[PDB]
Amino acid sequence: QQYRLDELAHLVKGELIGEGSLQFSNLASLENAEVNHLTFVNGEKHLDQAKVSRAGAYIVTAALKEHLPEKDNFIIVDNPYLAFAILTHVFDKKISSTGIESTARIHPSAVISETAYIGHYVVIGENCVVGDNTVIQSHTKLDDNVEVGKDCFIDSYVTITGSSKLRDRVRIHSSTVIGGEGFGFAPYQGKWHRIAQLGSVLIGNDVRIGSNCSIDRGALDNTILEDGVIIDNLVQIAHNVHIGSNTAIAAKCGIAGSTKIGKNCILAGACGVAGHLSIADNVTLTGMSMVTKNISEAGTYSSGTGLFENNHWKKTIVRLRQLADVPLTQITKRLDHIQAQIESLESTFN
Amino acid sequence: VQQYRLDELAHLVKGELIGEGSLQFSNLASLENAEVNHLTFVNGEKHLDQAKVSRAGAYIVTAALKEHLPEKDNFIIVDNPYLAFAILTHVFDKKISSTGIESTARIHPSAVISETAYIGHYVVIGENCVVGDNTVIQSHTKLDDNVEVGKDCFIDSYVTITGSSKLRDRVRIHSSTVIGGEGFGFAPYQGKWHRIAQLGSVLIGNDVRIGSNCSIDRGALDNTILEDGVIIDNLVQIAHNVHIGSNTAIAAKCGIAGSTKIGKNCILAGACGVAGHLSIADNVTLTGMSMVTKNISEAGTYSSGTGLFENNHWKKTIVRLRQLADVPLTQITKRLDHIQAQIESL
Amino acid sequence: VQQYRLDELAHLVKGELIGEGSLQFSNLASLENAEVNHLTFVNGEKHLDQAKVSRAGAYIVTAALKEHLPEKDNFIIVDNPYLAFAILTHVFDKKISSTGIESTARIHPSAVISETAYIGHYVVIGENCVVGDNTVIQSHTKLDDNVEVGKDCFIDSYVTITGSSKLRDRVRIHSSTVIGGEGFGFAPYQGKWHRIAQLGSVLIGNDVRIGSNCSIDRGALDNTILEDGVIIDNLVQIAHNVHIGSNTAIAAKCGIAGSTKIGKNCILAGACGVAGHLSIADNVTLTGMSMVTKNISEAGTYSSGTGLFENNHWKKTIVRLRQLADVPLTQITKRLDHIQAQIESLES
């Protein structure tokens, strides 16, 4: 199946140039796009690859189009990237399948929409709810009192337990565990007394969660992910974590128990955040940041040493292992003082 | 929900009762959300303000902390509120009394399954496997040949236990974990890597917890060993032949490289990385995201990392780090010594 | 149950046999665990204690070490006992004997499965799928539409293969792993994120090993690529459009961000993070927890980290590190120089 240029321009409220009747199989990169492909050009950094590209038509900005005169077909928009983002869904493989496969094992007390798809070997517990147009891909399981709203996607090998409540348009990818028993252990006798985790999880609308994630239920109360939170693969959300709306959590972040992260935060890959902390709205964290105390104000925060060639690096960590011995500041202040008694004596004897 | 008299609850934790012991409670609950029919706890002076504002009917607290709750009537006095609470959470837990073998379970005729075990839908169990008394093996999970699971164990969905792994009693393993999988055994030669097949196993002791999306690899020949009481959080990597001593806790996202020994009662925070062929002594604590590349022979708390900087301050600091190597760092208390010596005479 | 003759075993390792070449063996085992029906080995003198008292029926050894084992009868003599062990592991490695398709599998009729393939219980296989000769697909796994697997592949349980990923030959994918799933594509607009559907796929080359609990995402456009001979340990993130060159090794807990290219024969230690849109040359080694945010264009060895400190010594060092920016460390020797200057230029 194919889509006409003008039909796509319309979807992104973008100005068409050339022939709109042109049909495309797909969107494609500037390098591998044939004439049956639409492509995008995100600022002048892509110009050269664009110029020599064999794509049929080009999503561009007005300024960029002028610099692309050997080409005939365009969609002109303010944000070429966002326009691209919109159009991908046109060409995304959609699931229209409906109903329940007979390999499935659902409790009779469950409410399952007529417009929902329940895949093969799916197991659904007591008083569960699955809303309109939601997909539950094969093998997945919903424990008792798990609710899932409408237009969700739940991929295979997903464990939803601890009575979790999922709102609408929630997308949960494979091998992810939602609302499993969190890491609650009380120290005694040099042994560890397990704590049975008795709260749940509340995931808001428009949340995406990657694969191989663990979003633990609350010890008491709730693990909450507000609306529009996005979470990449291999992330740990510990018990009673609360993530504010529209926050983005990159792959391999870990957030320890009882921790609050504000709205509109951006955490880069492999960040770690200790337990029982508060992180303000509009906080950004670059790669491999470890956070041990509250961040009380908006901004960008970092930790780490960056990359060094091996020899340089070794020289530097020795210099660090020496650093606590070397009185830095004191040395500088003793200089100032020596500078002072020089300054004076040079003018006093003059 | 079923209720309990406050005196029963105090007795179960061997605590002191203050208030009317015939008052019944329906649940535990947080300081924030607790209601008149709930029991809560306060652990440290840091939760006192919250407690003061709490609607909770009764307070698990400490003799000292009780002094600061004048407006509150009902107490259980204990040395450690956390533990007391820990003990009581199981009384209010949704307790799974189910037994039998689901109809969709494929079980080899040589497997021995206790009549008080539960086996979920779509479980697979190989030749010569033992499932012990009161053990729950949830749906879709598989137990390859020669795997053994002791008594009062819990194994969740999408779990793989292969490598003929043996599990003792009260073992708790969470969803989509792989136990006994082939470890990372590869030989370098002339710019190629050559796979070596791994032929040892996994031994898991009594009272071991392992979280979701964990990977506990089998040993190469000898074993990966987790001693009694080890607790492991989500997304942890335990390589081939790693040995972890009793009661050691491993927080989320740690990685232990192959053939590393970890002592008794160690504590590693989240996202630590410990290299291969290392020894770590009993009673070692590692703070979040710490890296270990050498043996640690003495007990204690260790740490790596810069701490957090605001980005712009951070950048200027790494400018300085990159410079550190070129500065004669230790030679300069010596040069200042020399400079002050030639003012001394002047 | 499965047995091999001593002499067959000596042949495989190009070894020389002392004792009876008709004796059969069930397994390889350690000196301490080994029984009469098991073969073991000795590398170096250290382990002759365990060897002497081992119940093993046969001993892969060197000719020098055999002399320190008088009470034993059956040996395979070789140059490197460990290397010989290594070869034989594959012989004793429990391989799926069965062949064909379990009745519980659900397969779209447009799939093409070899008769020598094993398709396990509760496997789901979508449209236009292919499964090559001798390939094992263990129970509970699914191949989504248009996915292909080559010959001699091992594909364990609870694996997702989607984004119509293409797998060449002798590919091993361990349990609970996700191949070709939707990458992390989000366009920022006025605070919110617009999800970007992910339209390309995954190309996995021959002799690739991928561990358990890994995520290798599909391409946004084009393909995420693992070139032939790449090995990846457990719990690793490979983002969209990542391209990993020939025979590169990626240790546990590594994360590689979107559209990064990694050269041939690179080695990455545990818990490395590589940022997006980067190139890393052939022959670059990264030590534990390395932080890459720029292209690495020369082969060599690179690194991040402070070193491990005792906690209190740690606290003292970071306090010092915190004040480092407010310190003209560069001018200190020229300040000491200058200070000693106007000391010398004072006397007259």
In DSSP notation, B224-267 reads EEE-TT-EE-TT-EE-TT-EE-TT-EE-TT-EE-TT-EE-TT-E
Query: A315 CA to chain B: closest CA distance, Å?
Result: 6
For residues A19, A20, A25, A31, the Cα torsion angle rounded to the nearest 10 degrees is: 50
- CA of A308 vs chain B CAs: smallest distance (Å): 8
Query: A309 in helix, strand or coil?
Result: strand
Specify the amino acid at residue B154: F
Alpha carbon distance A298, A32 (integer Å): 42
Shortest Cα distance, chain A CAs vs residue B175, angstroms: 7
Distance (Å, rounded) from C-alpha A120 to C-alpha A116?
13
Distance (Å, whole) CA A169 – CA A96: 16
Residue with tokens 């307790």: B95
Residue A163 sits at the chain B interface (C-beta within 8 Å): no
Q: A346: which DSSP letter?
A: H
What's CA C201's distance to the chain center, in Å?
Answer: 21
Round to whole Å and give the CA distance between B200 and A293.
43
Q: Measuring CA to CA, which residue among B106, C138, B309, B37 is closest to residue A284?
A: B309
Q: What's the Cα-to-Cα distance from B300 to each of A54, A118, A162, A216, C5, rounded to whole Å?
A: 63, 52, 37, 30, 53
| Residue indicated by tokens 């609050």 | A260
For residue B298, how many other CB atoms are within 10 A of its CB? 9
> Which residue in B28, B104, B229 is closest to A191 by CB distance?
B229
Distance of CA B40 to the CA centre of its chain: 24
Q: What whole-number distance in Å separates Cα of residue B54 and Cα of residue B31? A: 5
Which element (helix H / strand E) includes B187? strand B186-189
Alpha-carbon distance of B125 to B137, in angstroms, equals 10
User: What does this entry list as its resolution, in Å?
Assistant: 2.7
Please, after which residues is chain C broken with C–N above 2.5 Å? Answer: none
DSSP B45: G
The alpha-helical segments, DSSP class H, found in A15-137 are: 47-51, 62-66, 80-88
Q: Which CATH number fits domain A100-309: 1.10.10.10, 2.160.10.10, 3.50.50.60, 2.40.50.140?
A: 2.160.10.10
Q: Which phi and psi angles does A135 have, rounded to 5°?
A: -105, 130
Distance (Å, whole) CA A291 – CA A272: 6
A328-348 vs B331-344: helix crossing angle, rounded to 10: 30
| Helix (H), strand (E), coil (C) string for chain C | CCCEEHHHHHHHCCCEEECCCCCEECEECCCCCCCCCEEEECCCHHHHHHHHHCCCCEEEECHHHHCCCCCCCCEEECCCHHHHHHHHHHHHCCCCCCCEECCCCEECCCCEECCCCEECCCCEECCCCEECCCCEECCCCEECCCCEECCCCEECCCCEECCCCEECCCCEECCCCEEEECCCCEEEECCEEEECCCCCEEEECCCCEECCCCEEECCCCCEEEECCCCEECCCCEECCCCEECCCCEECCCCEECCCCEECCCCEECCCCEECCCCEECCCEEECCCCEECCCECCCEEEECCCCCEEHHHHHHHHHHHHHHHHCCCCCHHHHHHHHHHHHHCCCC
Q: What is the dihedral of CA A60, A64, A70, A74, to 10 degrees?
A: 20
| Cα C270 to Cα C262: distance, rounded to the nearest angstrom | 16
How buried is C263 (Cβ within 10 angstroms: 0-12 exposed, 13-18 middle, 19+ buried)?
Answer: buried
CB contact (8 A) between residue A328 and residue C327: yes
Task: Indicate the class that CATH gives domain C311-348.
Answer: mainly alpha
Residue B240 known to be catalytic: yes
Helices and strands (H, E) in chain A, number of each type = 6, 40
Phi, psi of C15 (to 5 degrees): -100, 165
CB contacts of A138 in chain C (<8 Å) are 124, 142
Residue A145, classed as helix, strand or coil, is: coil
C-alpha gyration radius of chain B? 27
Question: In chain C, how long is the greatest CA-to-CA distance?
Answer: 105
Backbone φ and ψ of B328, nearest 5°: -70, 55
CA A161 – CA A145 distance, rounded (Å): 8
Walk across the sheet containing A15-17 and list its strands.
A15-17, A74-76, A57-60, A37-40, A26-27
Which amino acid is it at A60? Answer: V
User: Which tokens go with C56?
Assistant: 């093993």
CB-CB contact of B253 with C213 (8 Å): no
In 3D space, the residue among B293, A320, A315 whose CA is nearest the CA of residue C306 turns out to be A320
List the chains bordering chain C where 3 or more Cβ pairs fall under 8 Å: A, B
**Phi, psi at residue C277, to the nearest 5°?**
50, 30
Q: Name the structure determination technique.
A: X-ray
How many whole angstroms from its chain centre is CA B343? 60
Tell me which CATH homologous superfamily contains domain B101-310: Hexapeptide repeat proteins (2.160.10.10)
Structure tokens given for C6: 């001593």
Residue C284 near residue C299 (C-beta atoms within 8 A) = yes
- Could you say which DSSP state residue A252 is in? T
3-state secondary structure of A111: strand
DSSP-derived secondary structure for B80-133: -HHHHHHHHHTTSS------EE-TT-EE-TT-EE-TT-EE-TT-EE-TT-EE-T
> Which is the catalytic residue, given B140, B240, B243, B313?
B240
CA nearest neighbour of A234 among A218, A253, A219 = A253
φ, ψ for residue B303, nearest 5 deg: -160, 145
Give the CB-side neighbour count of residue C203, counting CA atoms within 13 A: 14
- Around Cβ B63, how many Cβ atoms within 10 Å? 11
Report the Cα A53 to chain-centroid distance in Å. Answer: 31
Please give the sequence-ordered ranges of beta strands (E in DSSP) within A161-204, or none if there are none.
Answer: 165-166, 171-172, 177-178, 185-188, 191-194, 200-203
Burial class (CB in 10 A: 0-12, 13-18, 19+), B182: buried
CB atoms within 10 A of CB B146: 18
B157 CB neighbours in chain A (<8 A) are 141, 159
Residue A233 sits at the chain C interface (C-beta within 8 Å):
yes
Q: Determine contact, residues A142/A129, Cβ cutoff 8 Å.
A: no
Residues belonging to chain A: 350
Residue ranges covered by each domain of chain C: 1-100, 101-310, 311-348
Opening angle at CA B32, ends B31 and B33, nearest 5: 100
Integer Cα distance of B340 and B335 in angstroms: 9
At the topology level, CATH places domain B311-346 in 1.20.5
Nearest Cα residue to C216 out of C290, C166, C268 = C166
Q: Which two tokens stand for residue C98?
A: 């069965």
For residue A114, the one-letter residue type is: E
Q: Residue C238: which of B226, A252, B148 has the closest Cα?
A: A252
Measured distance CA(A252)–CA(A268) in Å, rounded: 9
Q: State whether residue A322 sits within 8 Å of chain B by CB.
A: yes
**Burial zone of A227 (CB within 10 Å; 0-12 exposed, 13-18 middle, 19+ buried):** middle
d(CA B145, CA B129): 6
> What SS3 class is residue A324?
helix
Q: Which CATH class is domain A310-350?
A: mainly alpha
CB-CB contact of A235 with A248 (8 Å): no
* Helix pair A310-321, B311-324: axis angle to 10 deg: 100
Spatial CB neighbours of A196, under 8 Å, sequence gap ≥ 6: A181, A184, B89, B90, B92, B93
B120, B141, C235 from A123: Cα distances, Å: 10, 13, 26
- State the amino acid at position A324 in one-letter form: A
Alpha-carbon distance of C212 to C216, in angstroms, equals 11
Phi/psi for A279 (5° steps) reads -125, 120
B80 vs B41: CA distance, rounded Å: 10
CA dihedral A114, A118, A122, A124 (to 10 degrees): -30
Contacting residues for B95 by C-beta, under 8 A, at least 6 apart: none
C118 CB-near residues (< 8 Å, 6+ apart): C96, C98, C99, C100, C101, C135, C136, C137
Q: Do C329 and B320 touch (CB under 8 A)?
A: yes
- Within its chain, how far is the Cα of C27 from the centroid? 25
Read off the tokens for B39. Answer: 């029991």
Sequence-distant (6+) residues with CB within 8 A of B46 are none
CB distance from B221 to chain A under 8 Å?
Answer: no
Beta bridge partners of B225: B203, B243
In sequence order, the β-bridge partners of residue A171 are A153, A208
Chain B residues whose beta carbon lies within 8 Å of the beta carbon of residue A323: 324, 329
**Could you give the 3-state DSSP secondary structure of residue A154?**
strand
**C124 at the B interface (CB within 8 A)?**
no
Cβ neighbourhood burial of A340 (10 Å; 0-12, 13-18, 19+): exposed
Contacts of A among chains (3+ CB pairs under 8 A): B, C
The residue written with tokens 């609350």 in the block is A218
How far from the centroid of its chain's Cα atoms is residue C206's Cα? 14
Enumerate residues 6+ apart whose C-beta is below 8 A from B73. B19
Q: Are C302 and C296 in contact (CB under 8 A)?
A: yes
Q: Find how far residue C238's CA is from the centre of its chain.
A: 13
Phi, psi angle pair for C113, to nearest 5° = -115, 125
Q: Which of A272, A171, A293, A300 is nearest to A231 (CA)?
A: A171
CA distance C280 to chain B (A): 17
Q: Are C237 and A231 in contact (CB under 8 A)?
A: no
Residue located via tokens 């927890």: C289
**The residue type at A237:** I
CA nearest to A86, candidates A50, A40, A141? A40
User: Of the listed C121, C240, C243, C277, which one is catalytic?
Assistant: C240
Query: Which three-class secondary structure string do you get for C249-270?
Result: EECCCCEECCCCEECCCCEECC
Q: How far apart are CA A120 and CA A343, in angstroms?
A: 86
Q: Classify domain A1-99 at the CATH topology level.
A: 3.40.1390
CA separation for the pair B54, B49 (Å, rounded): 9
CATH number of the domain located at residue range(s) B1-100 in this protein: 3.40.1390.10
Give the separation between CA B234 and CA B213, rounded to whole angstroms. Answer: 6
Two tokens, residue A23: 């049909």
